[PDB]
A paper describes a structure:
Xanthophyllomyces dendrorhous β-fructofuranosidase (Xd-INV, EC 3.2.1.26) is a highly glycosylated dimeric enzyme that belongs to CAZy family GH32 and hydrolyzes sucrose and various fructooligosaccharides (FOS) and fructans releasing fructose.
First, the epigallocatechin moiety of EGCG is stacked to Trp105, with the OH next to the Fru O2 being linked to Glu334 carboxylates through water molecules, whilst its second hydroxyl is linked to Gln341(OE1) through a water molecule. The triphenyl ring of epigallocatechin is polar linked to the carbonyl of Leu661 at the C-terminus of the chain. On the other hand, the gallate ring is mainly accommodated by the loop Glu334-Asn342 through direct hydrogen bonds to Gln335 (NE2) and Gln341 (OE1). On the other hand, conformational changes are not observed in the residues at the active site upon binding of the different compounds, with the only exception of a switch in the Glu334 side-chain found in the crystal containing EGGC, possibly due to the steric hindrance associated to this bulky compound. As can be seen, the positions of catechol and the EGCG diphenolic part of benzopirane are very similar, while the aromatic ring of p-nitrophenol is slightly shifted towards the diethylenglycol trapped in the catechol containing crystals. In contrast, catechol, HQ, and EGCG bind at the inulin-type subsite +2, occupying the same position that the terminal glucose from 1-kestose. Furthermore, the significant reduction in hydrolysis rate presented with catechol and EGCG may explain the absence of FOS in the first 30–40 minutes of reaction, after which these molecules allow moderate FOS production.
Residue numbers in the entry:
A (entry chain A), B (entry chain A): 42 to 665
Write the structure that this text describes.
Amino acid sequence: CSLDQTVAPGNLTLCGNATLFTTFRPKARFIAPEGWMNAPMGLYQRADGSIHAGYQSHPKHIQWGNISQGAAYSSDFTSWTDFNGSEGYKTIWPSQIYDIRGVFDGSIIKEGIDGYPTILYTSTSFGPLGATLNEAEGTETQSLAYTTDDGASWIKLGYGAGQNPVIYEWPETNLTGFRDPYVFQSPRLEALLANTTSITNATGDHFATISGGVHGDGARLFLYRQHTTGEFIKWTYLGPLVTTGYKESYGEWSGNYGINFETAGVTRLNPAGAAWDNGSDTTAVDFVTFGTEQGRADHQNHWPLWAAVDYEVRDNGSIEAVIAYSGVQDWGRSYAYASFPVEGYRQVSVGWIYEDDDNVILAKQFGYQGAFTLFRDLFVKVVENVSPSTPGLFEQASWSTKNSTDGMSVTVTTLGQRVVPETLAAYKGNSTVSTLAPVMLNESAAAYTPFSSQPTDRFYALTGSFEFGLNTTAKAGFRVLASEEEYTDIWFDPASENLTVVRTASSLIKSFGNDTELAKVKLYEIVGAESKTLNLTVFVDGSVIEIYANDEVALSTRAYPWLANSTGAGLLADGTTAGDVVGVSGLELWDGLVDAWPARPANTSQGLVWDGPTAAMYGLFAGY
Amino acid sequence: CSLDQTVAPGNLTLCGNATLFTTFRPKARFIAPEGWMNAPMGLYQRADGSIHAGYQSHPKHIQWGNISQGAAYSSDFTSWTDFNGSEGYKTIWPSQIYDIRGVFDGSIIKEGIDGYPTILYTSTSFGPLGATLNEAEGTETQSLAYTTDDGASWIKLGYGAGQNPVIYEWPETNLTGFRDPYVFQSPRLEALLANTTSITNATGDHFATISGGVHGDGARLFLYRQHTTGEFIKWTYLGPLVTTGYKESYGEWSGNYGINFETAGVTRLNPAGAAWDNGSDTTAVDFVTFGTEQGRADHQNHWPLWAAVDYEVRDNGSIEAVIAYSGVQDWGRSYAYASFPVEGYRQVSVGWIYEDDDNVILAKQFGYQGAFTLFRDLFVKVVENVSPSTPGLFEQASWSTKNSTDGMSVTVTTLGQRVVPETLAAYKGNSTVSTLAPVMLNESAAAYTPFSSQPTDRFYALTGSFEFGLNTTAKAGFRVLASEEEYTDIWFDPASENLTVVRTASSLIKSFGNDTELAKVKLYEIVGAESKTLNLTVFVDGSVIEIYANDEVALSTRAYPWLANSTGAGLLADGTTAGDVVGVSGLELWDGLVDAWPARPANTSQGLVWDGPTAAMYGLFAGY
Ligand SMILES: *[C@@H]1O[C@H](CO)[C@@H](O[C@@H]2O[C@H](CO)[C@@H](O[C@@H]3O[C@H](CO)[C@@H](O)[C@H](O)[C@@H]3O)[C@H](O)[C@H]2NC(C)=O)[C@H](O)[C@H]1NC(C)=O
Ligand SMILES: *[C@@H]1O[C@H](CO)[C@@H](O[C@@H]2O[C@H](CO)[C@@H](O[C@@H]3O[C@H](CO)[C@@H](O)[C@H](O)[C@@H]3O)[C@H](O)[C@H]2NC(C)=O)[C@H](O)[C@H]1NC(C)=O
Ligand SMILES: O=C(O[C@@H]1Cc2c(O)cc(O)cc2O[C@@H]1c1cc(O)c(O)c(O)c1)c1cc(O)c(O)c(O)c1
Ligand SMILES: O=C(O[C@@H]1Cc2c(O)cc(O)cc2O[C@@H]1c1cc(O)c(O)c(O)c1)c1cc(O)c(O)c(O)c1
Ligand SMILES: O=C(O[C@@H]1Cc2c(O)cc(O)cc2O[C@@H]1c1cc(O)c(O)c(O)c1)c1cc(O)c(O)c(O)c1
Ligand SMILES: O=C(O[C@@H]1Cc2c(O)cc(O)cc2O[C@@H]1c1cc(O)c(O)c(O)c1)c1cc(O)c(O)c(O)c1
Ligand SMILES: O=C(O[C@@H]1Cc2c(O)cc(O)cc2O[C@@H]1c1cc(O)c(O)c(O)c1)c1cc(O)c(O)c(O)c1
Ligand SMILES: O=C(O[C@@H]1Cc2c(O)cc(O)cc2O[C@@H]1c1cc(O)c(O)c(O)c1)c1cc(O)c(O)c(O)c1
Ligand SMILES: O=C(O[C@@H]1Cc2c(O)cc(O)cc2O[C@@H]1c1cc(O)c(O)c(O)c1)c1cc(O)c(O)c(O)c1
Ligand SMILES: O=C(O[C@@H]1Cc2c(O)cc(O)cc2O[C@@H]1c1cc(O)c(O)c(O)c1)c1cc(O)c(O)c(O)c1
Ligand SMILES: O=C(O[C@@H]1Cc2c(O)cc(O)cc2O[C@@H]1c1cc(O)c(O)c(O)c1)c1cc(O)c(O)c(O)c1
Ligand SMILES: O=C(O[C@@H]1Cc2c(O)cc(O)cc2O[C@@H]1c1cc(O)c(O)c(O)c1)c1cc(O)c(O)c(O)c1
Ligand SMILES: O=C(O[C@@H]1Cc2c(O)cc(O)cc2O[C@@H]1c1cc(O)c(O)c(O)c1)c1cc(O)c(O)c(O)c1
Ligand SMILES: O=C(O[C@@H]1Cc2c(O)cc(O)cc2O[C@@H]1c1cc(O)c(O)c(O)c1)c1cc(O)c(O)c(O)c1
Ligand SMILES: O=C(O[C@@H]1Cc2c(O)cc(O)cc2O[C@@H]1c1cc(O)c(O)c(O)c1)c1cc(O)c(O)c(O)c1
Ligand SMILES: O=C(O[C@@H]1Cc2c(O)cc(O)cc2O[C@@H]1c1cc(O)c(O)c(O)c1)c1cc(O)c(O)c(O)c1
Ligand SMILES: *[C@@H]1O[C@H](CO)[C@@H](O)[C@H](O)[C@H]1NC(C)=O
Ligand SMILES: *[C@@H]1O[C@H](CO)[C@@H](O)[C@H](O)[C@H]1NC(C)=O
Ligand SMILES: *[C@@H]1O[C@H](CO)[C@@H](O)[C@H](O)[C@H]1NC(C)=O
Ligand SMILES: *[C@@H]1O[C@H](CO)[C@@H](O)[C@H](O)[C@H]1NC(C)=O
Ligand SMILES: *[C@@H]1O[C@H](CO)[C@@H](O)[C@H](O)[C@H]1NC(C)=O
Ligand SMILES: OC[C@H]1O[C@](O)(CO)[C@@H](O)[C@@H]1O
Ligand SMILES: OC[C@H]1O[C@](O)(CO)[C@@H](O)[C@@H]1O
């Protein structure tokens, strides 16, 4: 096998295991040392202020199985250190009858068993497991473990009556799934339920949701409440928090609710970040974030969504979360977002970016699959002085509108997402920064214009503000990972309101996905303005392209160009004329980013293994 | 609940857990500290000469499940010490996908992985498991672990290709079972196969049998050979060693071969003990020992059997063991016999004695279930100068006959079993011994005659030689655990050739089994003798009654009298007259025996637990 990246790629399926380990690999983000990873899990801020991040992990394999928690820590979300114990970087693994099929997603009770951080996780055992299969009760249960050494190891409660698993009864029949327990405190929900606690007897200070659905009848998020403060065995089922319809869609701005929820969480935000009021803060908004399955024809049939909700108290002492508006957390190849509280009134969200090799053609040659997104602060985005003539404004699809008293302006509210400032500062400070001259894209603009400074490798960030006429039909954006023969084009088209990533030329290697990514972006036009602005930030990190628009729209995707010189970048322009002009300013190239894993060598492969003929016999894991 | 043993028993099902722990409990034999035990496993003589004994174990439960190896050691088979590690007295437990359903029976490779003692055991996973169910491949596999600290702990090989499990392919389709690997060296089999090794390429110095059968078509013992000396991953299937018919019986002296084998082993014996010749010792005989299932209407549908076999070499380089004669290892409530080699050319066999509470009425009140038999030396029993007029002699049912040259006498050969001399010496030396005067049982003999010295508790041994007329119709034997109201009668009836244990009066507690035990005993009449002798030894140990006749016939059973004074013993006589007389001599009472577990307190209960509602959900174990 040839690794000559100055000529066309050969038959790369002849290459050995992990021979392509460093070729496309992200360097500036959270990723496992090697092998398979998927969903973030067990996220919490430790007593010293550092961040503990777990992830679904299958070392020395490139497909899912024996799923375990791998873990690492960081003081700044950006530079990480692996745990290293008897199971390497793993800290929780299948070990008991109740979890032998996989230690699935879980979340952290900060002050749990004997006061220690405690994880509530989905413990899986034998039987069909999946939204499209006939799953039975017991296959997915919920279990506890706690740590006395701040995440280096976890001790599970014993198996049995009054111990693990702690939640095992299905709250309704014919579930499509029953997993991903999300533990949270909520002054809001406590205040709302305070007059109903004699009906249910549940008076604890922790709530937990479990994600699932009902066969034939749509997804469900089930709400539980800790029965008694300071005690963690008994969790009382209150009722369904979120109920959606079988493949129901709230519209073009909102994905599709599919048939089953995964990795759902509940938070409360205000314009500054996390909100811990009981309802009294009128600027605060209740949100649910959730993945949906089987409501999408591509992207592994998965939508990572969010909804702003209004809580109502039911007669039986439960809560209905009524969806007020509903959006998309990321429009690309990402899923399984988790959020967790951080000091200084923050709620931080992170997801998993899958590869674009769905037929598993070069997975073994990679020697790993998957990475995280960047860590994102959540907040309520507020846009004042919005013009009522903004096209489609009053659909209020993934946003809310509040008219001024005179009816001449609107205040828009939606979910804000922005990369955590610790990462932006570290990235910028460690990079070679080029501040580029502003550019008018007019009749003289080429289709592609390389920046006056170019990246030196596949690790960089771009930023720019694109100013468009209110009635423009021009398109503009950024080309990245570009040589003459390979390139990835990121376009915004204000007339259609579509942000696209065109990947028909992203790689000479034909086995990788090449479908066009698409996100909807609403440019809220400002009263008195004669133009509208798209602020676009793009992170290029090995094969990851992660795009942020206006601290609101995120789109993560993959590009795998073969050629060593497919690293360039510049401006894209289409239909720009003397009359239809696009002004581009605030242009910066951050070349290099940071090495997110300073203790790791470049090649952290430990080889790949096969589980042997018993993998097919047990029928649980692919085995490689 | 009342524990007053001077009055009739109340409703003992009202008693708490382990309140009857010491009431019926053996003291002088191998038994777990508490909870459920079954089959012996992992038996081997350690480097210091001590004996390591494992057993199938489920602590803090009184039914089978999560089956593990519990273990202890002894320098004399008699006084034992528990291992004590992180899992108490357990040393191997379910921990991996391949063995999570249970660590079933296994046997020892004395010089295995890196030269260490190594166990090959049945690792079980999910799915229907049983001879009467539709079991599938993978549910039962065979796996390796080794010990670097002579049995205090075991390290399993890793899961995967070229590692555990090491044997997983079914050698034939539609197996009724696939377990209990028995590893052994055999100069005999090596000599027989030496001209066929180019056909199979299997040239290792270890063989292994796996016990099972084929649905609808009877039991099978499958023979494997280690592929290469010094290497323990590859075991080559040669062919079926023993093939028997669906519920076939060799006759009244031989039990029934049922539908499936369990815990089968292979040995070679001569008149002094174990034989390690290649075929050249003409006094040596090849034997197979094996349990059978579903060929019996009672005794949990289980026969512990043995067969003398003649090996034949097949064209494909495998061995057929042709049954020459076939017997019963124990006629009572015992099963799962294992044998292992011991220094000084010995082969030692031990089994499991189950309780007689098959409806589980007082199991929780006991707080334990099960014990071992005594440890038994195996050898070829030889009886010279046998009269050809011995009734039924030439059926050669569970014995062989060789005529003298003149046809006037016969040499009888069969499987001998006798309690290991270390135990007999320790028992006798620690007991208060009463040597009793010989007794003629004639017209004046009462039905029951108490011995002139009586036991002081439920821990004693009796011995006696009963001399019968050749044409007697009299019956005689021993009554044990006897007061006026409760007693257990052990009768021999030479005319019918039946040894019986009548248990209609064994206990006032009606929930225990009361069926009559029966064994066949052949009294080989000696040329010129005018009488025939039954040598009977009986061990009474809590609730265990273990009977040995003529170093040949064993019968283990249970009696649970309530009354504190139901400990007496004496002679039984029926149909003895002036003309039909039974002479009883060599009479001894050994009162007390030994405390087999000197470091254990009397009550080693640690309470019982329930597995909770998930036990029924997983459907693998009863859960208590
Ligand atoms: C490279 O990694 C693989 C693990 O992915 C190492 O093990 C090999 O794994 C492949 C599957 O990826 C196994 O192939 C399978 O073989 C069976 C038949 O033998 C076939 O039925 C399946 O469809 C599949 O082809 C392969 O047997 C297995 N090889 C082993 C265990 O030796 C492989 O060893 C790694 N290579 C190196 C040099 O480290
Ligand atoms: C005495 O030992 C038992 C374990 O055998 C301890 O746990 C209890 O176990 C029994 C089963 O033996 C459980 O009963 C079951 O309850 C469910 C319904 O609640 C019923 O569906 C079943 O048919 C069966 O009756 C019992 O719940 C369980 N009790 C527990 C966990 O508290 C028992 O605790 C031990 N007692 C003492 C004082 O230690
Ligand atoms: O979310 C939890 O606290 C909230 C977030 C948070 C944080 O990030 C760091 C910190 O210094 C304090 C802190 O107080 C938050 C909080 C504030 C309140 O006013 C309140 O009533 C509440 O229940 C909560 C939480 C979760 C837990 O699982 C837990 O056991 C606990 O004690 C607390
Ligand atoms: O039908 C599947 O299992 C069977 C039905 C079933 C159930 O209804 C409840 C339960 O407690 C266990 C359970 O095991 C069954 C099973 C059947 C088989 O034939 C088999 O090979 C197997 O591994 C197991 C199946 C299908 C699947 O597609 C799948 O991914 C899976 O894990 C399992
Ligand atoms: O906190 C911001 O607004 C406040 C909260 C808020 C809301 O939750 C919903 C809503 O209908 C209106 C609204 O007005 C608030 C506000 C308060 C002020 O004192 C102020 O000067 C202002 O412009 C506004 C904010 C944050 C921003 O990041 C921002 O860009 C902005 O224009 C405003
Ligand atoms: O279940 C069907 O699609 C799923 C539901 C769905 C939706 O509600 C809106 C939407 O924008 C896309 C969409 O894709 C879903 C889907 C799921 C899959 O697993 C899949 O393989 C696929 O092609 C697609 C379906 C039903 C049909 O009746 C049909 O004819 C068809 O081709 C497909
Ligand atoms: O302008 C509104 O029309 C539609 C939405 C829309 C958009 O999202 C983006 C865009 O580039 C153009 C656009 O034109 C749409 C439209 C709808 C019509 O019925 C129509 O005749 C037309 O010319 C054009 C509008 C405004 C609103 O505020 C609103 O609530 C609504 O339902 C609709
Ligand atoms: O885009 C503008 O600057 C460019 C981008 C940029 C930045 O992101 C951060 C920063 O520290 C400095 C900075 O200098 C850039 C720049 C580069 C040149 O070579 C140049 O000639 C120039 O006028 C400028 C801009 C915007 C403005 O709003 C403005 O009024 C102006 O004069 C210029
Ligand atoms: O020897 C270096 O790492 C070791 C090899 C290695 C691997 O093969 C696969 C893998 O999954 C992880 C991995 O970590 C190893 C390692 C071991 C240590 O003791 C250590 O302190 C460390 O940072 C790491 C090294 C070399 C380097 O060149 C380097 O810059 C560095 O930080 C470290
Ligand atoms: O049965 C095994 O040896 C036999 C019994 C035995 C013993 O009890 C103690 C002892 O001092 C030696 C000993 O030699 C036995 C033996 C004798 C031979 O002449 C022979 O050819 C043979 O293979 C064997 C055995 C099993 C094993 O599993 C093993 O790895 C091994 O090395 C040996
Ligand atoms: O039918 C039994 O299992 C089902 C059939 C089956 C198989 O054919 C192969 C296999 O790989 C797994 C497997 O799981 C199946 C299963 C079905 C169920 O409905 C169920 O509740 C369960 O625990 C499991 C069964 C019956 C039994 O009587 C039994 O003791 C047992 O453990 C299992
Ligand atoms: O070793 C015993 O016999 C030897 C072995 C043996 C056999 O295997 C089968 C057989 O057909 C006959 C047979 O004759 C052997 C024998 C050898 C002698 O030197 C001898 O004096 C004798 O009586 C006999 C033995 C052991 C005994 O325990 C015993 O009671 C007894 O009478 C004899
Ligand atoms: O399978 C039947 O018995 C089993 C085989 C068998 C034998 O071969 C000889 C013998 O001495 C006893 C004997 O007991 C077996 C048996 C197994 C059981 O599981 C059981 O519950 C039982 O009563 C007994 C059976 C068949 C029949 O055709 C029948 O009518 C019946 O009542 C029973
Ligand atoms: O004596 C033999 O008869 C039968 C077997 C036998 C036994 O086991 C114990 C017993 O108390 C008595 C007994 O009488 C049986 C017997 C069979 C008959 O056909 C018969 O006419 C008779 O009177 C009585 C005999 C001897 C043998 O040596 C032999 O091989 C055989 O098949 C049979
Ligand atoms: O049964 C016979 O002894 C009795 C049992 C027995 C034993 O088992 C071992 C031992 O060390 C001594 C021993 O003394 C027993 C005995 C007890 C008496 O009270 C007594 O009067 C007597 O003659 C005897 C016997 C057998 C004989 O073969 C014999 O010739 C004889 O005189 C006597
Ligand atoms: O305290 C005694 O044992 C402990 C209690 C106990 C139990 O409750 C349940 C059980 O499964 C085992 C068990 O073993 C315990 C024990 C602990 C030790 O440290 C020790 O050395 C020992 O021999 C044993 C004791 C008392 C006694 O009276 C006695 O004679 C004795 O040997 C030991
Ligand atoms: C990039 O590499 C290719 C092949 O090595 C070459 O054709 C091309 O001219 C190079 N430089 C570019 C596109 O700037
Ligand atoms: C470089 O990145 C590291 C790791 O996140 C960070 O701690 C450091 O401050 C950065 N350097 C700068 C901003 O100069
Ligand atoms: C044994 O105990 C019972 C009841 O306590 C009593 O009736 C009997 O006489 C006692 N002694 C015997 C049988 O020797
Ligand atoms: C060898 O022959 C026997 C008897 O035909 C057969 O049962 C066995 O399976 C054969 N061995 C093989 C196929 O390895
Ligand atoms: C008593 O039994 C112990 C334990 O087996 C044994 O070592 C000792 O020799 C026995 N005492 C005798 C025979 O006097
Ligand atoms: O790895 C299993 C985990 O991944 C998810 O399926 C999301 O893709 C979660 O619902 C689950 O806990
Ligand atoms: O506990 C399981 C073990 O017990 C047996 O069934 C014998 O009764 C063995 O065949 C098996 O290994």
